[PDB]
Chain A
Amino acid sequence: GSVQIVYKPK
């Protein structure tokens, strides 16, 4: 349905 993603560092 839905998700919040918090990305690892670039």
Chain B
Amino acid sequence: SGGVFVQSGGSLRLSCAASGATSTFDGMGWFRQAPGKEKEFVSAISYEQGSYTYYADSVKGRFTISRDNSKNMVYLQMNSLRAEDTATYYCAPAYEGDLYAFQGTQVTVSS
């Protein structure tokens, strides 16, 4: 029903708590699901500095994922948003960059 609303060309920052590397998980990331479409990878980052920073092709150059291990936080800076970024955004723990979901932020970008 309700969500965030951004003008095309605008920007938005998401955040997600990150417990830290358990036995099963070495990272955190985000996927999104647009109306009537499949869930699509967005971005993933390793808890270990250097280990991995994946982005979907559709967001490279516009989105930036970052971590603050001191705060147990992960962040997604979303710049130059376009109408096709309209979706619900979910964060999930990562193992080797794949996201595992077992809670979302709806974002509408208007042209």
Q: What residues of chain A have their CB less than 8 Å away from a CB belonging to chain B? A: 2-9
- List chain B residues, Cβ under 8 A from A8: 41, 44, 54, 96-99
Q: Is the CB of B100 within 8 A of A3?
A: yes
How far, in Å, is B61 (CB) from chain A's closest CB? 14
Interface of A is mostly: loop
- Count of chain A to chain B residue pairs whose CB atoms are closer than 8 Å in the complex: 34
Q: Select from chain A the residue with minimum beta-carbon distance to B41.
A: A6
Q: Is the CB of B98 within 8 A of A5?
A: yes
Q: What residues of chain B have their CB less than 8 Å away from a CB belonging to chain A? A: 31, 39-41, 44, 54-57, 92, 96-102
Q: Is the CB of A9 within 8 A of B101?
A: no
Which of B31, B97, B102 is close to A2, meaning CB atoms less than 8 Å apart? B102
How far, in Å, is A4 (CB) from chain B's closest CB? 4
Of the A-B pairs whose beta carbons lie under 8 Å apart in the complex, a sample of 25, sorted by A's number, is A2-B102, A3-B100, A3-B101, A3-B102, A4-B39, A5-B98, A5-B100, A5-B101, A6-B31, A6-B39, A6-B40, A6-B41, A6-B99, A6-B101, A7-B41, A7-B98, A8-B54, A8-B96, A8-B97, A8-B98, A8-B99, A9-B41, A9-B54, A9-B55, A9-B56
